[PDB]
Amino acid sequence: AVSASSRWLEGIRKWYYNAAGFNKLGLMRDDTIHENDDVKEAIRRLPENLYNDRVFRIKRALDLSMRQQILPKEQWTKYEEDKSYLEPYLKEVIRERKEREEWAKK
């Protein structure tokens, strides 16, 4: 039951999404996920072009922590910028146990 306030919501998102350094620190929403055993199977299905480019950031990322030096603020990741690339493949495996579990009930 929100339309104009819907527009009025996104700011805090865009704000809050800027309130967590990884947007400044070059991450995405995907790469910050807690570890899941499905993510394993998920990560399996990633092609390298996708897979690899995820990787090189982390290597670059952590390094600044040791020195606590945050990226030049322009080069910071942006709110409009997003990619959910991880989740869609994540989504499949989820259903899979569901189906199995569902069958597995009786």
Binding site: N49, N52, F56, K59, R60, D63, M66, R67
Partner: protein
Amino acid sequence: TFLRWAAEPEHDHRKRMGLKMLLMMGLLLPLVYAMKRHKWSVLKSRKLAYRPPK
């Protein structure tokens, strides 16, 4: 002053170590502080290059 002395006869003597340790102390920490960094000098000096065949 008398009872102030009583509970701690070593009082006068014991203070010696205080000055003893201090100048002893200011020695090593910057020294350590030097060494540590000397090692960490490499890590914080890293560079990374992503040059995919891609």
